[PDB]
Amino acid sequence: DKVTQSSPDQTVASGSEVVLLCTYDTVYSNPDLFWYRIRPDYSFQFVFYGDDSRSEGADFTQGRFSVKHILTQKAFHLVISPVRTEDSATYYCAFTLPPPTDKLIFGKGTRVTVEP
Amino acid sequence: DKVTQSSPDQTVASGSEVVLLCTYDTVYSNPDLFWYRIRPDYSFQFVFYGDDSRSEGADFTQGRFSVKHILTQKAFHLVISPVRTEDSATYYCAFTLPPPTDKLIFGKGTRVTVEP
């Protein structure tokens, strides 16, 4: 069970559009998928959730964030359009193991630096 | 590089003392260490931070939480005393890979359910 984040770290100007890649490899079907981000001040923020039939963004993502969950590719890509300075962080894609365990398996992270 | 969380998942009574064990396996000099916790609603909370000479906890930790950082044993144990129902969550220990990487390696997670 592991997550792959193939996107190189990126530095972009505010107002750009960015895509963070993620693919999951797990023996369990329909895992709960997530996107979290570590901000410079250490806060770990919930960004997006999704399973095979639905996705849900955090309150603050309305209209600028969306995920591309492609089943045949086992992909759970995050798209930010447009990105803002406050989006500077390291994004972690992850999935949980089935209950009662339901513990998280994290990807290695992808840093996005947004120049003001 | 690995993070080992040795405490068993546990359910305990409000008012009890809980010890969350964490040992890190890395060759990097003075890595940043962390304790994070995730609540049922998917929200993650920064709990404690520390390097080889200091430690700083979240604002809510003053008075009830503390970390035991044993350099010789690469140990970063979290102690909650006393625990309250609000502390129910799964705790994750992690350390930072040095620059330019600056990404986290997580432990498996330890569930602590506190019953009133």
Side-chain angles (χ1 to χ4, degrees), chain A residues 86-115:
Chain A
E86 59 242 61
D87 300 321
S88 274
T90 301
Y91 295 70
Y92 292 89
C93 182
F95 70 82
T96 48
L97 291 176
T101 300
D102 80 292
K103 290 170 175 181
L104 293 153
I105 296 300
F106 286 99
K108 295 179 171 297
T110 295
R111 180 175 58 245
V112 177
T113 300
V114 188
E115 306 172 56

mmCIF file of all heavy atoms in Angstrom, chain A residues 86-115:
data_model
loop_
_atom_site.group_PDB
_atom_site.id
_atom_site.type_symbol
_atom_site.label_atom_id
_atom_site.label_comp_id
_atom_site.label_asym_id
_atom_site.label_seq_id
_atom_site.Cartn_x
_atom_site.Cartn_y
_atom_site.Cartn_z
ATOM 1 N N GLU A 86 -1.370 32.349 -0.448
ATOM 2 C CA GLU A 86 -1.741 31.535 0.703
ATOM 3 C C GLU A 86 -1.764 30.036 0.416
ATOM 4 O O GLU A 86 -2.003 29.241 1.312
ATOM 5 C CB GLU A 86 -3.089 31.974 1.254
ATOM 6 C CG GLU A 86 -4.241 31.899 0.248
ATOM 7 C CD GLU A 86 -4.857 33.260 -0.032
ATOM 8 O OE1 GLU A 86 -4.133 34.155 -0.524
ATOM 9 O OE2 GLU A 86 -6.068 33.434 0.244
ATOM 10 N N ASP A 87 -1.541 29.656 -0.836
ATOM 11 C CA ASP A 87 -1.530 28.245 -1.209
ATOM 12 C C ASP A 87 -0.138 27.639 -1.131
ATOM 13 O O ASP A 87 0.058 26.469 -1.463
ATOM 14 C CB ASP A 87 -2.108 28.051 -2.610
ATOM 15 C CG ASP A 87 -3.534 28.531 -2.718
ATOM 16 O OD1 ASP A 87 -4.329 28.338 -1.775
ATOM 17 O OD2 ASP A 87 -3.871 29.089 -3.760
ATOM 18 N N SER A 88 0.843 28.467 -0.782
ATOM 19 C CA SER A 88 2.206 27.989 -0.645
ATOM 20 C C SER A 88 2.245 26.948 0.462
ATOM 21 O O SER A 88 1.927 27.243 1.625
ATOM 22 C CB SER A 88 3.148 29.140 -0.297
ATOM 23 O OG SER A 88 3.585 29.799 -1.463
ATOM 24 N N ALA A 89 2.635 25.730 0.108
ATOM 25 C CA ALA A 89 2.708 24.665 1.082
ATOM 26 C C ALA A 89 3.202 23.415 0.416
ATOM 27 O O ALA A 89 3.550 23.429 -0.763
ATOM 28 C CB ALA A 89 1.323 24.413 1.673
ATOM 29 N N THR A 90 3.300 22.344 1.197
ATOM 30 C CA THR A 90 3.709 21.045 0.680
ATOM 31 C C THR A 90 2.454 20.175 0.751
ATOM 32 O O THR A 90 1.843 20.009 1.815
ATOM 33 C CB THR A 90 4.840 20.428 1.496
ATOM 34 O OG1 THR A 90 5.963 21.315 1.474
ATOM 35 C CG2 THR A 90 5.250 19.086 0.905
ATOM 36 N N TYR A 91 2.040 19.700 -0.412
ATOM 37 C CA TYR A 91 0.844 18.908 -0.550
ATOM 38 C C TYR A 91 1.096 17.415 -0.471
ATOM 39 O O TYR A 91 1.997 16.884 -1.136
ATOM 40 C CB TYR A 91 0.121 19.296 -1.846
ATOM 41 C CG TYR A 91 -0.401 20.728 -1.847
ATOM 42 C CD1 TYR A 91 0.475 21.818 -1.913
ATOM 43 C CD2 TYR A 91 -1.774 20.993 -1.748
ATOM 44 C CE1 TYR A 91 0.001 23.136 -1.874
ATOM 45 C CE2 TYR A 91 -2.262 22.314 -1.706
ATOM 46 C CZ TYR A 91 -1.368 23.372 -1.766
ATOM 47 O OH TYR A 91 -1.837 24.664 -1.680
ATOM 48 N N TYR A 92 0.314 16.752 0.381
ATOM 49 C CA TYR A 92 0.412 15.317 0.605
ATOM 50 C C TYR A 92 -0.862 14.612 0.198
ATOM 51 O O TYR A 92 -1.955 14.952 0.664
ATOM 52 C CB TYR A 92 0.673 15.013 2.092
ATOM 53 C CG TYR A 92 2.028 15.460 2.576
ATOM 54 C CD1 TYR A 92 2.219 16.743 3.076
ATOM 55 C CD2 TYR A 92 3.137 14.618 2.482
ATOM 56 C CE1 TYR A 92 3.481 17.182 3.466
ATOM 57 C CE2 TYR A 92 4.407 15.049 2.874
ATOM 58 C CZ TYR A 92 4.565 16.336 3.359
ATOM 59 O OH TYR A 92 5.812 16.792 3.728
ATOM 60 N N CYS A 93 -0.715 13.627 -0.668
ATOM 61 C CA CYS A 93 -1.832 12.832 -1.116
ATOM 62 C C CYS A 93 -1.824 11.625 -0.166
ATOM 63 O O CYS A 93 -0.752 11.205 0.284
ATOM 64 C CB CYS A 93 -1.577 12.392 -2.544
ATOM 65 S SG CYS A 93 -2.901 11.427 -3.306
ATOM 66 N N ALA A 94 -2.997 11.091 0.170
ATOM 67 C CA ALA A 94 -3.055 9.959 1.082
ATOM 68 C C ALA A 94 -4.359 9.190 0.999
ATOM 69 O O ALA A 94 -5.348 9.676 0.441
ATOM 70 C CB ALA A 94 -2.855 10.452 2.521
ATOM 71 N N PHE A 95 -4.342 7.982 1.558
ATOM 72 C CA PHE A 95 -5.518 7.131 1.635
ATOM 73 C C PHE A 95 -5.487 6.388 2.969
ATOM 74 O O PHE A 95 -4.420 6.235 3.583
ATOM 75 C CB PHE A 95 -5.635 6.158 0.443
ATOM 76 C CG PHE A 95 -4.613 5.061 0.425
ATOM 77 C CD1 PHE A 95 -4.788 3.910 1.194
ATOM 78 C CD2 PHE A 95 -3.496 5.148 -0.413
ATOM 79 C CE1 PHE A 95 -3.870 2.853 1.131
ATOM 80 C CE2 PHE A 95 -2.566 4.092 -0.488
ATOM 81 C CZ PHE A 95 -2.756 2.944 0.287
ATOM 82 N N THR A 96 -6.667 6.021 3.461
ATOM 83 C CA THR A 96 -6.787 5.308 4.726
ATOM 84 C C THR A 96 -6.980 3.818 4.515
ATOM 85 O O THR A 96 -7.457 3.378 3.462
ATOM 86 C CB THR A 96 -8.004 5.803 5.543
ATOM 87 O OG1 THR A 96 -9.151 5.857 4.691
ATOM 88 C CG2 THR A 96 -7.751 7.184 6.125
ATOM 89 N N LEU A 97 -6.562 3.050 5.512
ATOM 90 C CA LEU A 97 -6.716 1.611 5.508
ATOM 91 C C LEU A 97 -8.133 1.364 6.021
ATOM 92 O O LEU A 97 -8.703 2.212 6.687
ATOM 93 C CB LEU A 97 -5.695 0.989 6.451
ATOM 94 C CG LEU A 97 -4.253 1.101 5.977
ATOM 95 C CD1 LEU A 97 -3.326 0.546 7.037
ATOM 96 C CD2 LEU A 97 -4.096 0.340 4.658
ATOM 97 N N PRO A 98 -8.730 0.221 5.690
ATOM 98 C CA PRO A 98 -10.097 -0.074 6.152
ATOM 99 C C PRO A 98 -10.215 -0.134 7.686
ATOM 100 O O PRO A 98 -9.217 -0.318 8.389
ATOM 101 C CB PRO A 98 -10.368 -1.444 5.530
ATOM 102 C CG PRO A 98 -9.574 -1.395 4.253
ATOM 103 C CD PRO A 98 -8.270 -0.784 4.720
ATOM 104 N N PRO A 99 -11.428 0.102 8.218
ATOM 105 C CA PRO A 99 -11.636 0.056 9.679
ATOM 106 C C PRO A 99 -11.459 -1.388 10.160
ATOM 107 O O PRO A 99 -11.571 -2.324 9.360
ATOM 108 C CB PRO A 99 -13.085 0.521 9.838
ATOM 109 C CG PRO A 99 -13.316 1.381 8.608
ATOM 110 C CD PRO A 99 -12.645 0.571 7.534
ATOM 111 N N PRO A 100 -11.261 -1.596 11.477
ATOM 112 C CA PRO A 100 -11.158 -0.601 12.560
ATOM 113 C C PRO A 100 -9.877 0.239 12.518
ATOM 114 O O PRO A 100 -9.792 1.270 13.173
ATOM 115 C CB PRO A 100 -11.177 -1.469 13.827
ATOM 116 C CG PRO A 100 -11.664 -2.834 13.361
ATOM 117 C CD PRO A 100 -11.093 -2.961 12.001
ATOM 118 N N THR A 101 -8.873 -0.233 11.781
ATOM 119 C CA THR A 101 -7.585 0.467 11.661
ATOM 120 C C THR A 101 -7.714 1.891 11.125
ATOM 121 O O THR A 101 -7.321 2.844 11.785
ATOM 122 C CB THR A 101 -6.637 -0.293 10.729
ATOM 123 O OG1 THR A 101 -6.407 -1.610 11.246
ATOM 124 C CG2 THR A 101 -5.330 0.433 10.581
ATOM 125 N N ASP A 102 -8.214 2.005 9.901
ATOM 126 C CA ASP A 102 -8.405 3.281 9.218
ATOM 127 C C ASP A 102 -7.278 4.305 9.385
ATOM 128 O O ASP A 102 -7.514 5.513 9.365
ATOM 129 C CB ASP A 102 -9.785 3.895 9.511
ATOM 130 C CG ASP A 102 -9.840 4.602 10.835
ATOM 131 O OD1 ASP A 102 -9.759 3.933 11.873
ATOM 132 O OD2 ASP A 102 -9.967 5.841 10.836
ATOM 133 N N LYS A 103 -6.046 3.817 9.501
ATOM 134 C CA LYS A 103 -4.895 4.701 9.628
ATOM 135 C C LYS A 103 -4.441 5.147 8.239
ATOM 136 O O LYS A 103 -4.733 4.492 7.239
ATOM 137 C CB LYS A 103 -3.778 4.010 10.404
ATOM 138 C CG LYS A 103 -4.140 3.833 11.879
ATOM 139 C CD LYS A 103 -3.161 2.936 12.602
ATOM 140 C CE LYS A 103 -3.487 2.888 14.080
ATOM 141 N NZ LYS A 103 -2.507 2.038 14.796
ATOM 142 N N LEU A 104 -3.741 6.271 8.191
ATOM 143 C CA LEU A 104 -3.281 6.865 6.942
ATOM 144 C C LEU A 104 -1.943 6.403 6.382
ATOM 145 O O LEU A 104 -0.981 6.163 7.131
ATOM 146 C CB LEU A 104 -3.219 8.388 7.104
ATOM 147 C CG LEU A 104 -4.526 9.163 7.287
ATOM 148 C CD1 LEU A 104 -4.246 10.420 8.065
ATOM 149 C CD2 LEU A 104 -5.139 9.469 5.923
ATOM 150 N N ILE A 105 -1.901 6.311 5.048
ATOM 151 C CA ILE A 105 -0.702 5.973 4.282
ATOM 152 C C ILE A 105 -0.475 7.261 3.472
ATOM 153 O O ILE A 105 -1.349 7.696 2.712
ATOM 154 C CB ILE A 105 -0.938 4.790 3.307
ATOM 155 C CG1 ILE A 105 -1.273 3.511 4.091
ATOM 156 C CG2 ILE A 105 0.286 4.574 2.430
ATOM 157 C CD1 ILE A 105 -0.202 3.073 5.052
ATOM 158 N N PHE A 106 0.675 7.892 3.675
ATOM 159 C CA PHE A 106 0.995 9.160 3.007
ATOM 160 C C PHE A 106 1.977 9.064 1.839
ATOM 161 O O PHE A 106 2.834 8.179 1.791
ATOM 162 C CB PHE A 106 1.610 10.157 4.015
ATOM 163 C CG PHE A 106 0.626 10.759 4.980
ATOM 164 C CD1 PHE A 106 0.500 10.255 6.272
ATOM 165 C CD2 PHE A 106 -0.097 11.895 4.633
ATOM 166 C CE1 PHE A 106 -0.330 10.885 7.221
ATOM 167 C CE2 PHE A 106 -0.932 12.536 5.572
ATOM 168 C CZ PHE A 106 -1.044 12.031 6.865
ATOM 169 N N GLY A 107 1.845 10.003 0.917
ATOM 170 C CA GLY A 107 2.760 10.078 -0.201
ATOM 171 C C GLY A 107 3.924 10.901 0.345
ATOM 172 O O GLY A 107 3.859 11.387 1.486
ATOM 173 N N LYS A 108 4.971 11.084 -0.456
ATOM 174 C CA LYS A 108 6.143 11.836 -0.014
ATOM 175 C C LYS A 108 6.007 13.363 -0.007
ATOM 176 O O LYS A 108 6.851 14.056 0.567
ATOM 177 C CB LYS A 108 7.365 11.441 -0.840
ATOM 178 C CG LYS A 108 7.817 9.996 -0.670
ATOM 179 C CD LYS A 108 9.031 9.699 -1.558
ATOM 180 C CE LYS A 108 9.635 8.331 -1.256
ATOM 181 N NZ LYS A 108 10.145 8.261 0.141
ATOM 182 N N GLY A 109 4.962 13.890 -0.649
ATOM 183 C CA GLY A 109 4.757 15.330 -0.665
ATOM 184 C C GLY A 109 5.302 16.053 -1.884
ATOM 185 O O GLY A 109 6.233 15.582 -2.552
ATOM 186 N N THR A 110 4.659 17.163 -2.216
ATOM 187 C CA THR A 110 5.055 17.986 -3.348
ATOM 188 C C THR A 110 4.952 19.434 -2.906
ATOM 189 O O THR A 110 3.878 19.887 -2.495
ATOM 190 C CB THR A 110 4.120 17.777 -4.582
ATOM 191 O OG1 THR A 110 4.257 16.442 -5.065
ATOM 192 C CG2 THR A 110 4.479 18.754 -5.711
ATOM 193 N N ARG A 111 6.076 20.139 -2.932
ATOM 194 C CA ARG A 111 6.089 21.529 -2.539
ATOM 195 C C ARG A 111 5.683 22.460 -3.660
ATOM 196 O O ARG A 111 6.118 22.300 -4.807
ATOM 197 C CB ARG A 111 7.466 21.935 -2.036
ATOM 198 C CG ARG A 111 7.547 23.396 -1.611
ATOM 199 C CD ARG A 111 8.890 23.734 -0.997
ATOM 200 N NE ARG A 111 9.995 23.462 -1.913
ATOM 201 C CZ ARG A 111 10.936 22.539 -1.710
ATOM 202 N NH1 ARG A 111 10.919 21.773 -0.621
ATOM 203 N NH2 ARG A 111 11.912 22.403 -2.589
ATOM 204 N N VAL A 112 4.809 23.403 -3.327
ATOM 205 C CA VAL A 112 4.363 24.410 -4.261
ATOM 206 C C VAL A 112 4.670 25.765 -3.626
ATOM 207 O O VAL A 112 4.187 26.069 -2.533
ATOM 208 C CB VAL A 112 2.847 24.330 -4.551
ATOM 209 C CG1 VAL A 112 2.441 25.478 -5.485
ATOM 210 C CG2 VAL A 112 2.486 22.978 -5.170
ATOM 211 N N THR A 113 5.576 26.512 -4.240
ATOM 212 C CA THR A 113 5.930 27.833 -3.749
ATOM 213 C C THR A 113 5.289 28.837 -4.682
ATOM 214 O O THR A 113 5.524 28.815 -5.905
ATOM 215 C CB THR A 113 7.454 28.050 -3.723
ATOM 216 O OG1 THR A 113 8.066 27.076 -2.857
ATOM 217 C CG2 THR A 113 7.772 29.460 -3.228
ATOM 218 N N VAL A 114 4.447 29.695 -4.115
ATOM 219 C CA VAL A 114 3.730 30.705 -4.887
ATOM 220 C C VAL A 114 4.319 32.074 -4.640
ATOM 221 O O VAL A 114 4.245 32.594 -3.534
ATOM 222 C CB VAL A 114 2.231 30.744 -4.520
ATOM 223 C CG1 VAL A 114 1.474 31.668 -5.463
ATOM 224 C CG2 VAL A 114 1.642 29.343 -4.567
ATOM 225 N N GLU A 115 4.936 32.633 -5.671
ATOM 226 C CA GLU A 115 5.555 33.943 -5.589
ATOM 227 C C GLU A 115 4.473 35.026 -5.603
ATOM 228 O O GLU A 115 3.562 34.987 -6.424
ATOM 229 C CB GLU A 115 6.468 34.174 -6.797
ATOM 230 C CG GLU A 115 7.522 33.114 -7.030
ATOM 231 C CD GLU A 115 8.260 33.321 -8.349
ATOM 232 O OE1 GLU A 115 8.818 34.423 -8.558
ATOM 233 O OE2 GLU A 115 8.273 32.386 -9.184
#
